[PDB]
């Protein structure tokens, strides 16, 4: 970790963004008409979702608060600053809502009781790999509807969300190589 | 252009083959989070 | 389009110049009761600096919003946000904590006025003067540019007429007043260049 | 050489004249308080269309 960090707590921040957003679009569907299995596992899926934006945001706290111990400057950017700062912001907010969704699904659990608690899964990354898909397949066909920079920023983010998958500091073989080929496509096209 | 969308539509699904504990690791941090924050802006000041 | 995100940056280098001083203020208040009067004024004109410029970033980028989004500008704007609304929470704090006091403590006619401009001036020419001793002592050159940048950001914010009105003197008409005569802006555009200068000097050294 | 002179320069400042009490309105915190408070919502509802786009 070299005299500036900038430039890796700023790609930390774009996935812990991308994580974040996708968690909020489920959080704000959350908040009359919606049937119990279905309200549960939207607060699942937005809980991991947090989980995983909060995993993304402490890794930057922590290559930040390394950097700021090991280098002997103490010279900090702006821009870091401001940074650091939203990054605590949204820690704070990822970690309420988190605490909020753990808790109303534990109110929903005591409504029921199970004699399959031999059971599903709801696996993080297949969310983010779908959601990444169903992102860049708006966008091809927006495209094709006429709306060229919300194609660019669309197109953006699905890499970020992939990239976020092969990541070995924030956690299939034939997986990662079917990911690993899959930036390409969407890098193309963008 | 068609081709992207073929390939997008034709995707294939992932195989895959602790929540309570790590909301309190993260609340744990929270007073390291603003500590160093904040020693990240006192650094920004000459005195 | 794509440049409106470094006006944005631009104002956000301003609005953390000036939160980073509020907050100076603000944390020597967390105890006599003239200083800490004087102390609580200070931070909360700071804060009230601080919330025009956040104010003017959001006004900027929803003008352009509507009229003509990149990940950085998200996230800026997000932050603005957040200390947009921090600030306003500890300004009210302190508009409360002021009356108290007022009411509490007995000379208020007397007291001199306090002045956000001058604040920003003396703390500005204080960083660079600072600065300059570093620099001569052999001291850190990178800590020398952020300081004379930082005062160079705290001038400019009087020096910009979308932003060197000053919140107290309301118009009646919902415009803030200007408070500085026309010898303050000379005096503090010519301070202006000779920092900038300096800073420009400092970095052929570095280079 | 330049150092010197641009420390003397600063330690040599004049505080400023400003406007006499009398060319200005009085003073109010109050009323910057109230409208910087009503520009919340317009805040936030940026915000979101940013995200959402």
Same mark, same amino acid.
């Given at each position: 970790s070299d005299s500036n960090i900038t430039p890796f707590v700023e790609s930390?921040? /774009?996935? /812990?963004?991308?994580?974040?957003?996708? /968690?909020?679009?489920?959080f704000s569907q959350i908040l009359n008409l919606i049937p119990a299995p279905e309200l549960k596992?939207?607060?699942? $899926?937005?809980? #991991? *979702?947090?989980?995983?934006? *909060?995993?993304?945001?402490?890794?930057?706290?922590? #290559?930040?608060?390394?950097?700021?111990?090991?280098?002997?400057?103490?010279?900090?950017?702006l821009?870091?600053?401001?940074?650091?700062?939203?990054?605590?912001?949204?820690?704070? $907010?990822?970690?309420?809502? /988190?605490?909020?969704? +753990?808790?109303?699904?534990?109110? =929903?659990?005591?409504?029921?009781?199970?004699?399959? =608690?031999?059971?599903?899964?709801?696996?993080? $990354?297949?969310?983010?790999?779908? +959601?990444?898909?169903?992102?860049?397949?708006?966008?091809? +066909?927006?495209?094709?509807?006429?709306?060229?920079?919300?194609?660019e920023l669309a197109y953006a983010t699905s890499l970020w969300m992939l990239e976020i998958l092969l990541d070995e500091h924030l956690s299939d073989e034939s997986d990662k190589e079917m990911i690993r080929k899959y930036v390409s496509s969407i890098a193309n096209r963008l | 252009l068609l081709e992207f969308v073929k390939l997008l539509e034709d995707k294939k699904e992932l195989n895959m083959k602790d929540i309570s504990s790590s909301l309190i690791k993260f609340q744990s941090m929270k007073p390291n989070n603003d500590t160093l924050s904040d020693n990240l802006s006192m650094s920004m000041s000459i005195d």
């Open positions: 930390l921040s /774009a996935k /812990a963004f991308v994580m974040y957003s996708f /968690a909020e679009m489920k596992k939207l607060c699942m $899926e937005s809980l #991991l *979702l947090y989980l995983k934006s *909060l995993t993304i945001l402490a890794s930057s706290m922590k #290559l930040t608060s390394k950097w700021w111990y090991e280098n002997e400057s103490k010279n900090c950017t821009k870091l600053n401001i940074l650091v700062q939203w990054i605590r912001d949204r820690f704070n $907010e990822c970690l309420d809502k /988190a605490e909020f969704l +753990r808790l109303k699904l534990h109110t =929903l659990n005591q409504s029921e009781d199970p004699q399959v =608690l031999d059971d599903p899964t709801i696996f993080v $990354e297949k969310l983010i790999y779908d +959601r990444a898909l169903d992102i860049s397949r708006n966008a091809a +066909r927006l495209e094709m509807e006429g709306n060229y920079n919300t194609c | -």
